[PDB]
């Protein structure tokens, strides 16, 4: 209907208007379910326009936003509490580090372009923009923290910047918005005979909101405040493909570890408590205060404990016993007077903090947690498990990486470098390459190469009878046809 | 927990801050401001001393001129003029005027107050009986000024100036919560409240609200009343603008053309303010929500006629209090607590000392905490101290204050209904 | 500068004011959340601030201290309490040792300008300035301590100085700030239609306010005193990007170890008292003395008490029993007389300090702690943990490094050697390198080479058939082509 | 003024009232009526007609006994409505039979 | 239907649940006749409460009373509430007024 938010959003609204216009003429209609696999929550509409001046929108947003971001908050704050634990933190650290590593005198994640362009110049512009995006995120110094948040908090998102008077040159660094502050929506803007399939483009806009009024832990006096509708074009975001049994209940990778982490630490405490409680000696002095009114009977009790009570304490700063000179007595000598030759009184000792373990369950649970956190078994070469883990790492990276594509296509569109269709035609593949630890890469490369050499060695006697050299090269050394020709030519030159 | 249905509380109203007044941050209590008043008549500080410059008064056109040689007869009730002579009169407004008599006539012998005399003189002026006049001094007189060639009693008129000042003082305000432990504990168990922090909020809030409300009231208190004097339509109701009375709307009917009448009067009042202060056309209005609803629903630009919904300026008092800018010219604020219906206009310059009304904070919202050991119940509260003041010359009627020193703080005598920077309008008939 | 408050720091005020204004001039706008990634606490002010002079700053600090930094101070004290214990402090020692390498007849952390700059003359000036920073800090002798404190408390701060008579060459020795005394903040200097998203230069100032009037530890006779507001430019600081679930309440890596550090301390002491208690003998006498006032019965109680009490101690200075001559009887003969007609008077024994362990939980917890302190599991060739710690350390160094980059640009810019714009374009790379343990570096490199040699050796028989020697150098020996040519040219020379 | 939370943001009105709203311009203009082409008044398809002036949500009280309109304010918080519907139990089916003759 | 478009819901998990409310109150007694709600939307704040209100008393205006120039008298209108007014003029106010409507 109309633009009714701060003017700073106007250029993003314009982008949204164009995208929506494309949705209006879109022939991707006659679809039963909302056209979305994950992320944004669905809403119905009051009309075929679903008009709302950015304020009225909140009637239905509130309905679906309560608890809304609050359950997102329960999950994330839990994820942080989880991460805060030792032997959780490490799982996160290793995973995040393998996804994003840093090395001396070299590059960091980079755009890798091998598809046709109108000019190398265009390729260069894309690569140059990619570099500025990294500079904006300060990826080269802080990239691993952005990833960690994505991995752990399950999602990450940033606010894009436009001038806005000279939007072409207004491209500036992204402000990471704090986790738990957003939730995405989508509207059914059309109807038929109860439940249509037609033109529901949905827009797919999102809400930002920071209800800092809840317990203000450590002086949380300020935060952004009451919810606002955002044009979508303005946000860079990503999340894991992990959900609950239904809806859009997005969870983090760490979600699986929530259970064992808490029961583990609870058990570690159960073990400590078992052994601290009862740690000292323990005994009840029973005092016969009979033939006395209660008001005075207590004085006999007080007298006896004042002369009998082991008023002795252990100094945890210096391993000594306070005021017990000389250094060690031969015995603890105590006398009780009985009121007759009748055993009314007594000294009743109690069970101590015995070494019952057998501390085996903790071991079980700790190992379970290490696995819950997606830690490879060797932690606490290329093997099936190391490889599985490596697959996991690149898959995470190939989801995370959207974070550098979204602002990239945005900048290229703003500069008049690429059109939307061209971008969509290019990818396909404009993938982003991450660096690997060369130490391990070198070892992995030696692996298999060693086998190939041993295989050639064994195969050798049949080189003149069963196996051609081309065959040895392509089937044992796994060389390509081009690679073989190149190696043959290099050798001919090397001959002299 | 028998299905607790959440809870409610009131929202906190917003404020107009100090957007339309001086802010003078202070680093000490009791500051001071001084001023220079160009003056003439050989004694800068004297009864009857005359200021060289003033927004409401004309200059003495014959001071360096012929008046140096001779006195002019004054106009007075019942006297008769002589054709060709020149009479002098200092008006209550428009100041020094020299009038040549075109006729031999008398002036309102029944006049009493200067206001009545001024009125008849104005009529005689309109009539063409009395005409504004000035001339220099015959050179043959000037030739011997300062006693030359045996002459006497011929000094030149002199000028100078008088510097004087005004000072302020900060008054303060404080509040406590005086709450209990048991209540706070229950609240923690009901809503999860801290029940000290919420109170802290309330107290600090109330203090800030009071101060801002006080500033607005001081604006209303010192502002002059508009639709009066030089801005008055003679057939009008004196200070109040209606919609049910054609005199204020030039016979309008048809809201698309009628509502614009108010905008017209607003400009007149804003312009008169410039006339009063010598600084510039008013640049801000604060008004009842009903006034604003009208402003936001009329095309305030220049056009044939036009009416629609109240969408031109925010009208709520729930998000803000600042409605927007009227015509791109005046900052519009909503008097969310207006007692009746009306609107005050005024001018505030880029110079913080150019505002008429000044706020000058020194101490603010200092928290205080402790507990009384007799029952150990907590005590908490907050303290603020600031002081306000008014512009020297805000009255404008007087060219100068008594004793070369005055309080810069408002008082009835100092400014009620006198401040050159602001004018009041009563509104009825919406 | 509305008022010349603390004119002592006017040069710093000028620097911050300059930066603040330049930030305002720039379109650092259209940002939803305050553009603060990490570091010092956030606070909001009104449009056009309306929150000055420094007295307003004190409002910020109270709100940010009472419920805020006061906790931070507890955390600082906690880190010290943590480090005060053993099996903790040594982890720190290991980290510090690896973090900063000190070796004979070599260099120490040094600025290395091997990337493009205007000229060698400028580079030389920068290198001299770097050296003076180290000289100011006596880093080459006290660098370990500077770093240790940074790591342990998760934050280092140093007060900078300008002459100011001839401020151009004003940087002189830096002064470490006392821990816990100063709070840093960033205020949002803006407001709009409910929720500003525009530019603020954020103040970036800090306030010192402690007093020995209230002790965290006695023996202290100096502190900050009242609330002193000093501009950000005035200081040099760094910290780890580690915070709690909310706010800016900065924690250290060692935070993770607090839990187990104390669980271990607690178990250690519990074990000690479990075994110490009841080591001596233990016995309670019950005497059948009835029908007497205490004033009479006491004689009978003393009759027994001063006869049956083995009034001796074990001399722990010299292993002997006091007055026990000869050294030990073959028996201790005791006696008691009874007054009633039943065997009621007796002496009970208590069970004694026996040994029930199974002392294994404490071991488990100690291991968990040691790990929690951020250490390799190789401790009580080349492996993954060592590589992991090399990475942990380069990050600690990378972050710590600001301790030099900050005063370096400050004095370079102050004198005028380089400009601010140049600094921002130049780094990128103005990197400072830390020395690496040459012993271990050689060993690592040697193993890498051994593997490379072995693979070359294996390839050898096939070089003239399938693998060109150029290729083997490229893939097996991991050489560049320039390196290959260099080796070929040097060989030709060796042969002559 | 009476809630301090927000100005009316929804209009509920009779079919005749909406016919008028639909046939008057809402922006600021010289004059305007025309045909009732905006804010669809056809209760067959909806209740919601449109947003008045881009500011208020206009609904149709298709059962008004005589002819009136009413306005009101709903905030972005279920509490700020004044009126609340609380479906402790809702739209729960009953299914069974009476075995004497087995009718369902 | 538009049955829930403008209502709150706050579904219950029991029948006959309960809602709480918090009212800021000033004047030393949270529950008393004459107690004032600090942020009531219909009434202005007591601008003197933290200031002169604790310094001196402000007698209320009443029918038949007369002011002294320079003094200050208070009152609370039924609408807009609390006010303090200076006596710029010596006046008396309608001795025949009774109900607040007349006095206001």
GROMACS .gro file of C-alpha atoms in nm, chain C residues 106-408:
model
  303
 1032UNK     CA    1   6.760  -1.314   1.854
 1033UNK     CA    2   6.462  -1.088   1.834
 1034UNK     CA    3   6.143  -1.043   2.030
 1035UNK     CA    4   5.802  -0.946   1.907
 1036UNK     CA    5   5.872  -0.713   1.617
 1037UNK     CA    6   5.701  -0.503   1.360
 1038UNK     CA    7   5.748  -0.648   1.010
 1039UNK     CA    8   5.666  -0.413   0.726
 1040UNK     CA    9   5.713  -0.651   0.433
 1041UNK     CA   10   5.405  -0.529   0.246
 1042UNK     CA   11   5.374  -0.207   0.040
 1043UNK     CA   12   5.417   0.130   0.213
 1044UNK     CA   13   5.510   0.472   0.078
 1045UNK     CA   14   5.885   0.432   0.129
 1046UNK     CA   15   6.163   0.257   0.330
 1047UNK     CA   16   6.211   0.584   0.517
 1048UNK     CA   17   5.857   0.568   0.644
 1049UNK     CA   18   5.899   0.203   0.723
 1050UNK     CA   19   6.209   0.278   0.923
 1051UNK     CA   20   6.026   0.546   1.120
 1052UNK     CA   21   5.751   0.298   1.199
 1053UNK     CA   22   5.999   0.036   1.308
 1054UNK     CA   23   6.165   0.288   1.542
 1055UNK     CA   24   5.831   0.382   1.692
 1056UNK     CA   25   5.747   0.021   1.751
 1057UNK     CA   26   6.076  -0.026   1.929
 1058UNK     CA   27   6.006   0.271   2.153
 1059UNK     CA   28   5.669   0.124   2.253
 1060UNK     CA   29   5.848  -0.188   2.363
 1061UNK     CA   30   6.113   0.024   2.532
 1062UNK     CA   31   5.844   0.216   2.717
 1063UNK     CA   32   5.693  -0.107   2.837
 1064UNK     CA   33   6.035  -0.272   2.892
 1065UNK     CA   34   5.856  -0.543   2.696
 1066UNK     CA   35   6.167  -0.743   2.620
 1067UNK     CA   36   6.198  -0.805   2.998
 1068UNK     CA   37   5.837  -0.755   3.125
 1069UNK     CA   38   5.635  -0.862   2.817
 1070UNK     CA   39   5.555  -1.191   2.987
 1071UNK     CA   40   5.394  -1.005   3.271
 1072UNK     CA   41   5.207  -0.767   3.049
 1073UNK     CA   42   5.065  -1.056   2.852
 1074UNK     CA   43   5.000  -1.272   3.155
 1075UNK     CA   44   4.789  -1.003   3.314
 1076UNK     CA   45   4.605  -0.947   2.990
 1077UNK     CA   46   4.524  -1.309   2.952
 1078UNK     CA   47   4.434  -1.376   3.313
 1079UNK     CA   48   4.204  -1.083   3.377
 1080UNK     CA   49   4.088  -1.084   3.011
 1081UNK     CA   50   4.190  -0.720   2.963
 1082UNK     CA   51   4.494  -0.488   2.957
 1083UNK     CA   52   4.485  -0.113   2.980
 1084UNK     CA   53   4.757   0.156   2.957
 1085UNK     CA   54   4.723   0.534   3.004
 1086UNK     CA   55   4.891   0.731   2.718
 1087UNK     CA   56   5.058   1.069   2.758
 1088UNK     CA   57   5.093   1.395   2.567
 1089UNK     CA   58   5.362   1.642   2.687
 1090UNK     CA   59   5.157   1.882   2.630
 1091UNK     CA   60   5.407   2.172   2.590
 1092UNK     CA   61   5.535   2.033   2.260
 1093UNK     CA   62   5.271   1.761   2.204
 1094UNK     CA   63   5.404   1.676   1.859
 1095UNK     CA   64   5.656   1.433   2.007
 1096UNK     CA   65   5.445   1.373   2.319
 1097UNK     CA   66   5.427   0.995   2.359
 1098UNK     CA   67   5.634   0.889   2.656
 1099UNK     CA   68   5.603   0.584   2.879
 1100UNK     CA   69   5.264   0.410   2.909
 1101UNK     CA   70   5.109   0.337   3.244
 1102UNK     CA   71   4.916   0.027   3.329
 1103UNK     CA   72   4.581   0.097   3.486
 1104UNK     CA   73   4.482  -0.063   3.815
 1105UNK     CA   74   4.233  -0.349   3.762
 1106UNK     CA   75   3.870  -0.294   3.852
 1107UNK     CA   76   3.892   0.081   3.874
 1108UNK     CA   77   3.767   0.199   3.537
 1109UNK     CA   78   3.445   0.160   3.342
 1110UNK     CA   79   3.419   0.213   2.967
 1111UNK     CA   80   3.105   0.318   2.778
 1112UNK     CA   81   2.962   0.397   2.428
 1113UNK     CA   82   2.651   0.626   2.432
 1114UNK     CA   83   2.400   0.646   2.146
 1115UNK     CA   84   2.387   1.012   2.065
 1116UNK     CA   85   2.063   1.017   1.872
 1117UNK     CA   86   1.680   0.988   1.872
 1118UNK     CA   87   1.399   0.991   1.607
 1119UNK     CA   88   1.046   0.855   1.555
 1120UNK     CA   89   1.087   0.585   1.825
 1121UNK     CA   90   1.409   0.393   1.754
 1122UNK     CA   91   1.696   0.583   1.592
 1123UNK     CA   92   1.907   0.409   1.339
 1124UNK     CA   93   2.138   0.699   1.264
 1125UNK     CA   94   2.488   0.821   1.340
 1126UNK     CA   95   2.647   0.862   1.676
 1127UNK     CA   96   3.020   0.891   1.746
 1128UNK     CA   97   2.935   0.702   2.068
 1129UNK     CA   98   3.163   0.907   2.313
 1130UNK     CA   99   3.409   0.608   2.370
 1131UNK     CA  100   3.504   0.742   2.715
 1132UNK     CA  101   3.573   0.600   3.055
 1133UNK     CA  102   3.549   0.670   3.427
 1134UNK     CA  103   3.773   0.576   3.721
 1135UNK     CA  104   3.612   0.569   4.071
 1136UNK     CA  105   3.757   0.328   4.341
 1137UNK     CA  106   3.849   0.388   4.702
 1138UNK     CA  107   4.048   0.201   4.969
 1139UNK     CA  108   3.774   0.317   5.200
 1140UNK     CA  109   3.613  -0.021   5.111
 1141UNK     CA  110   3.855  -0.307   5.071
 1142UNK     CA  111   3.855  -0.602   4.831
 1143UNK     CA  112   4.180  -0.686   5.010
 1144UNK     CA  113   4.342  -0.491   5.291
 1145UNK     CA  114   4.690  -0.330   5.286
 1146UNK     CA  115   4.592  -0.086   5.005
 1147UNK     CA  116   4.643   0.290   5.057
 1148UNK     CA  117   4.572   0.443   4.720
 1149UNK     CA  118   4.290   0.438   4.461
 1150UNK     CA  119   4.109   0.640   4.184
 1151UNK     CA  120   3.899   0.839   4.436
 1152UNK     CA  121   3.617   1.030   4.269
 1153UNK     CA  122   3.463   0.992   3.926
 1154UNK     CA  123   3.720   1.095   3.667
 1155UNK     CA  124   3.605   1.113   3.301
 1156UNK     CA  125   3.881   1.061   3.044
 1157UNK     CA  126   3.855   1.038   2.654
 1158UNK     CA  127   3.911   0.692   2.481
 1159UNK     CA  128   4.207   0.818   2.280
 1160UNK     CA  129   4.392   0.844   2.612
 1161UNK     CA  130   4.425   0.471   2.648
 1162UNK     CA  131   4.552   0.153   2.497
 1163UNK     CA  132   4.360  -0.162   2.559
 1164UNK     CA  133   4.260  -0.508   2.456
 1165UNK     CA  134   4.054  -0.799   2.578
 1166UNK     CA  135   3.925  -1.131   2.453
 1167UNK     CA  136   3.586  -1.120   2.275
 1168UNK     CA  137   3.428  -1.317   2.554
 1169UNK     CA  138   3.111  -1.202   2.719
 1170UNK     CA  139   2.810  -1.336   2.903
 1171UNK     CA  140   2.470  -1.409   2.746
 1172UNK     CA  141   2.395  -1.038   2.751
 1173UNK     CA  142   2.549  -0.698   2.814
 1174UNK     CA  143   2.922  -0.629   2.784
 1175UNK     CA  144   3.033  -0.793   3.103
 1176UNK     CA  145   3.367  -0.925   2.974
 1177UNK     CA  146   3.504  -1.260   3.094
 1178UNK     CA  147   3.824  -1.453   3.022
 1179UNK     CA  148   3.898  -1.791   2.874
 1180UNK     CA  149   3.977  -1.911   3.223
 1181UNK     CA  150   3.617  -1.840   3.319
 1182UNK     CA  151   3.539  -2.187   3.188
 1183UNK     CA  152   3.773  -2.333   3.450
 1184UNK     CA  153   3.612  -2.163   3.746
 1185UNK     CA  154   3.361  -2.434   3.795
 1186UNK     CA  155   3.607  -2.732   3.812
 1187UNK     CA  156   3.878  -2.524   3.970
 1188UNK     CA  157   3.668  -2.499   4.274
 1189UNK     CA  158   3.518  -2.845   4.242
 1190UNK     CA  159   3.872  -2.975   4.263
 1191UNK     CA  160   3.973  -2.746   4.548
 1192UNK     CA  161   3.659  -2.852   4.731
 1193UNK     CA  162   3.722  -3.224   4.672
 1194UNK     CA  163   4.088  -3.191   4.771
 1195UNK     CA  164   4.001  -3.037   5.101
 1196UNK     CA  165   3.717  -3.279   5.160
 1197UNK     CA  166   3.956  -3.567   5.106
 1198UNK     CA  167   4.203  -3.421   5.343
 1199UNK     CA  168   3.961  -3.372   5.622
 1200UNK     CA  169   3.804  -3.717   5.558
 1201UNK     CA  170   4.140  -3.882   5.627
 1202UNK     CA  171   4.279  -3.644   5.895
 1203UNK     CA  172   3.976  -3.655   6.109
 1204UNK     CA  173   3.972  -3.955   6.340
 1205UNK     CA  174   4.341  -4.042   6.282
 1206UNK     CA  175   4.418  -4.018   6.668
 1207UNK     CA  176   4.240  -4.250   6.899
 1208UNK     CA  177   3.892  -4.163   7.001
 1209UNK     CA  178   3.692  -4.255   7.310
 1210UNK     CA  179   3.396  -4.136   7.518
 1211UNK     CA  180   3.358  -4.226   7.881
 1212UNK     CA  181   3.014  -4.261   8.040
 1213UNK     CA  182   3.015  -4.234   8.421
 1214UNK     CA  183   2.723  -4.350   8.646
 1215UNK     CA  184   2.735  -4.065   8.899
 1216UNK     CA  185   2.387  -3.972   9.015
 1217UNK     CA  186   2.221  -3.807   9.317
 1218UNK     CA  187   2.482  -3.530   9.326
 1219UNK     CA  188   2.489  -3.158   9.239
 1220UNK     CA  189   2.747  -3.072   8.973
 1221UNK     CA  190   2.954  -2.909   9.249
 1222UNK     CA  191   2.998  -3.256   9.407
 1223UNK     CA  192   2.976  -3.485   9.104
 1224UNK     CA  193   3.262  -3.296   8.945
 1225UNK     CA  194   3.504  -3.454   9.194
 1226UNK     CA  195   3.410  -3.801   9.074
 1227UNK     CA  196   3.426  -3.693   8.713
 1228UNK     CA  197   3.779  -3.550   8.775
 1229UNK     CA  198   3.877  -3.869   8.959
 1230UNK     CA  199   3.825  -4.056   8.634
 1231UNK     CA  200   3.921  -3.775   8.393
 1232UNK     CA  201   4.262  -3.707   8.539
 1233UNK     CA  202   4.348  -4.078   8.568
 1234UNK     CA  203   4.224  -4.217   8.233
 1235UNK     CA  204   4.345  -3.931   8.016
 1236UNK     CA  205   4.654  -4.023   7.822
 1237UNK     CA  206   4.788  -3.668   7.846
 1238UNK     CA  207   5.027  -3.691   7.551
 1239UNK     CA  208   5.074  -3.566   7.197
 1240UNK     CA  209   5.259  -3.671   6.885
 1241UNK     CA  210   5.549  -3.446   6.818
 1242UNK     CA  211   5.520  -3.363   6.455
 1243UNK     CA  212   5.841  -3.155   6.460
 1244UNK     CA  213   6.040  -3.462   6.563
 1245UNK     CA  214   5.857  -3.796   6.531
 1246UNK     CA  215   5.824  -3.882   6.899
 1247UNK     CA  216   5.551  -3.913   7.162
 1248UNK     CA  217   5.585  -3.645   7.428
 1249UNK     CA  218   5.712  -3.779   7.763
 1250UNK     CA  219   5.669  -4.134   7.640
 1251UNK     CA  220   5.971  -4.306   7.783
 1252UNK     CA  221   6.050  -4.583   7.707
 1253UNK     CA  222   5.921  -4.547   7.351
 1254UNK     CA  223   5.621  -4.780   7.372
 1255UNK     CA  224   5.461  -5.010   7.627
 1256UNK     CA  225   5.344  -5.353   7.521
 1257UNK     CA  226   5.005  -5.257   7.663
 1258UNK     CA  227   4.800  -4.970   7.795
 1259UNK     CA  228   4.632  -5.082   8.117
 1260UNK     CA  229   4.321  -4.878   8.207
 1261UNK     CA  230   4.069  -4.914   8.488
 1262UNK     CA  231   3.725  -4.801   8.602
 1263UNK     CA  232   3.507  -4.861   8.909
 1264UNK     CA  233   3.126  -4.884   8.884
 1265UNK     CA  234   2.876  -4.758   9.149
 1266UNK     CA  235   2.544  -4.896   9.018
 1267UNK     CA  236   2.461  -5.271   9.011
 1268UNK     CA  237   2.476  -5.301   8.630
 1269UNK     CA  238   2.762  -5.272   8.380
 1270UNK     CA  239   2.659  -4.929   8.253
 1271UNK     CA  240   2.976  -4.722   8.309
 1272UNK     CA  241   3.202  -4.786   8.014
 1273UNK     CA  242   3.410  -4.617   7.750
 1274UNK     CA  243   3.305  -4.632   7.386
 1275UNK     CA  244   3.540  -4.610   7.100
 1276UNK     CA  245   3.465  -4.424   6.781
 1277UNK     CA  246   3.548  -4.592   6.434
 1278UNK     CA  247   3.875  -4.414   6.328
 1279UNK     CA  248   4.036  -4.273   6.010
 1280UNK     CA  249   4.023  -4.588   5.801
 1281UNK     CA  250   4.087  -4.594   5.423
 1282UNK     CA  251   3.791  -4.656   5.195
 1283UNK     CA  252   3.942  -4.539   4.863
 1284UNK     CA  253   3.900  -4.593   4.558
 1285UNK     CA  254   4.038  -4.236   4.545
 1286UNK     CA  255   3.940  -4.178   4.179
 1287UNK     CA  256   3.688  -3.896   4.149
 1288UNK     CA  257   3.939  -3.637   4.239
 1289UNK     CA  258   4.157  -3.765   3.956
 1290UNK     CA  259   3.876  -3.736   3.706
 1291UNK     CA  260   3.799  -3.384   3.817
 1292UNK     CA  261   4.163  -3.280   3.810
 1293UNK     CA  262   4.192  -3.400   3.454
 1294UNK     CA  263   3.877  -3.213   3.357
 1295UNK     CA  264   4.016  -2.901   3.517
 1296UNK     CA  265   4.352  -2.917   3.363
 1297UNK     CA  266   4.184  -2.940   3.026
 1298UNK     CA  267   3.947  -2.650   3.126
 1299UNK     CA  268   4.242  -2.423   3.169
 1300UNK     CA  269   4.299  -2.431   2.793
 1301UNK     CA  270   4.586  -2.675   2.779
 1302UNK     CA  271   4.700  -2.961   2.547
 1303UNK     CA  272   4.622  -3.314   2.664
 1304UNK     CA  273   4.977  -3.410   2.586
 1305UNK     CA  274   5.067  -3.269   2.926
 1306UNK     CA  275   5.016  -3.354   3.290
 1307UNK     CA  276   5.638  -3.522   1.785
 1308UNK     CA  277   5.369  -3.309   1.627
 1309UNK     CA  278   5.006  -3.362   1.710
 1310UNK     CA  279   4.668  -3.206   1.668
 1311UNK     CA  280   4.659  -3.049   2.011
 1312UNK     CA  281   4.989  -2.882   1.956
 1313UNK     CA  282   4.873  -2.749   1.623
 1314UNK     CA  283   4.549  -2.642   1.792
 1315UNK     CA  284   4.734  -2.451   2.057
 1316UNK     CA  285   4.959  -2.293   1.801
 1317UNK     CA  286   4.636  -2.155   1.656
 1318UNK     CA  287   4.499  -2.056   1.999
 1319UNK     CA  288   4.818  -1.870   2.064
 1320UNK     CA  289   4.840  -1.694   1.733
 1321UNK     CA  290   4.487  -1.565   1.803
 1322UNK     CA  291   4.583  -1.455   2.152
 1323UNK     CA  292   4.883  -1.279   1.999
 1324UNK     CA  293   4.673  -1.130   1.720
 1325UNK     CA  294   4.434  -0.978   1.968
 1326UNK     CA  295   4.703  -0.881   2.222
 1327UNK     CA  296   4.895  -0.712   1.937
 1328UNK     CA  297   4.664  -0.411   1.950
 1329UNK     CA  298   4.875  -0.319   2.256
 1330UNK     CA  299   5.142  -0.216   2.007
 1331UNK     CA  300   4.938  -0.113   1.704
 1332UNK     CA  301   4.749   0.143   1.906
 1333UNK     CA  302   5.044   0.343   2.057
 1334UNK     CA  303   5.226   0.288   1.725
   0.00000   0.00000   0.00000
